[model samples]
Target: SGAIYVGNYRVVNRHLATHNDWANLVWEDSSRDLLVSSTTAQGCDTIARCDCQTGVYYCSSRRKHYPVSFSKPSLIFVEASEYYPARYQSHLMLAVGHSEPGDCGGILRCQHGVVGIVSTGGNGLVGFADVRDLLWLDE
Candidate 1:
């Protein structure tokens, strides 16, 4: 019931609080965390969560959350692939999150694709796709 940054534009939950009757939405449930908001030093509103001490980046690109890269602290910048502009989808595919990973026979077990602007869940695999019209808010 609050607001968050869909890139740079502010979008409140009230506008999207209901489980939309989106017959096309292949997942369930959602969230309210702000990206690149007023809480980071890195400039980009979104960052892939990682532990600087352990050099581990927790990955959520799949249904099962696990570590993908163990490296120095880094905010991996990924130039959006061929799907962000004309088509509104992230090049990174995700788990639909209908149930726990490996459960409910779900292929898309997480909010795995482009972050849909307003985040739906803790996409441990968060990144920037379309630095689009709001690249200014990137800090």
Candidate 2:
């Protein structure tokens, strides 16, 4: 289990794209601080955090056509939990929902344990047939 980008950014317009011409457009500082792209219709700024020993990183971004995106930025605790002498597998949890096609909601990584929130079923939607798991792979 390693660090993963759940849904930081997606480029709608080429000029506005972060990964377009900007080669160094994205990078983490020596301190590991970094900013993520905005998910909101109005656009957003980067998200940054310090090294662990601080605490869980709580972050949220609002996407017009999607449900509020929230996450615990750091999985240091989960990594720390591995040393507790218990059989523990890393699990990433993401909650998503929206109505538009671009806004239509689904898990980005369902096979890797990511699940979507279904209003009808008590449990979040399971196993994506079309969408592939984009989560980080174990190195």
Candidate 3:
């Protein structure tokens, strides 16, 4: 089988760093599209220095997008977690009996804003990388 495309965009910026397992992409052309920091669920490699650079990403379903606060909180609730540090040294963890296969790069949203991204996991527990700092990579 061939590669399945999701979306495409010109990367104007990136949130990449050493000893980090997560990453963020900034689109080139700005538009009215309320793009939010989300994640990818496809089995493609879209992590740090992602192999699938041209991967398409959609924000929400048929529902309208809502306002998100930039506030960060500790002990935030996520879709999955168990906490295992990767070789790149990210704040990793897992969620018991919650995450599914290829759930890597899933969004870690909170009442305020997103906190992290799913790193890797399966069979009950899943690992995620804290993205709080990564989000402000340039600041």
Candidate 4:
């Protein structure tokens, strides 16, 4: 259960690992193996089984495991028009505080586990794309 940081991508894993984003994609520098602690990444308890080489950031693969729950949820949105796009049922809209444009793609978590990822947000409300069906985590 660890987090990784890249050039512009920051992710928080289940174990409270904070991964900063937007650094470099060098093969030798990316030595730390990235892992997702919230839920099992596929059949295993880890993620980022592949590495970043040259300009490739991720490797596409698949597997399965359990699920997660939410408690006192939160969400974030960017623009008004983003509020009315696809992914309604699969996403949860919640009231948060001070979420801004760059807040999207950030990880939302609770005591239970990883709640979801910041999809979009406005003044005080944010939307999350449920991690349950996120192809990256579940697949």
Residue runs of model 1 more than 4 Å from their true location after superposition? 1-3, 6-8, 11-46, 49-90, 99-136
Give lDDT tens digits, candidate 1, residues 9-122: 432222232333232232222211122223222222342222222111123334353322222322333333332222233322222222221121111111222122222223
lDDT value, candidate 4, whole model: 0.33
**Weakest lDDT window of 10 consecutive positions for candidate 3:** 27-36
Tens digits of lDDT, candidate 3, 1-139: 0111122311111122112212443321111111222234423322232111111221222122222222222233333223321223324434443444434444544433434454444565544444434432222
Better of 2 and 3 by lDDT: 3
TM-score per candidate, chains pooled? 0.19, 0.18, 0.35, 0.36
Q: Point to the candidate with the largest lDDT.
A: 4
The 10-residue segment of model 4 with minimum total lDDT is 53-62
Quote the positional error of residue 59 for candidate 4 in Å: 27
Top-down TM-score ranking: 4, 3, 1, 2
| Every model: Cα RMSD to truth | 12.9, 15.1, 13.9, 14.8
lDDT of each: 0.26, 0.24, 0.31, 0.33
Model 3 segments more than 4 A misplaced: 1-89, 135-139
Model 3 CA lDDT for position 21: 16
Residue pair clashes in candidate 2: 35-47, 36-47, 100-104
Q: Across residues 10-114, which tens digit of lDDT does each residue of candidate 2 receive? A: 222111224642443432221111222333233232222221111111111223222233332222111222113322222223233322222222323221232
- Model 1 error, position 134 (Å): 8.3
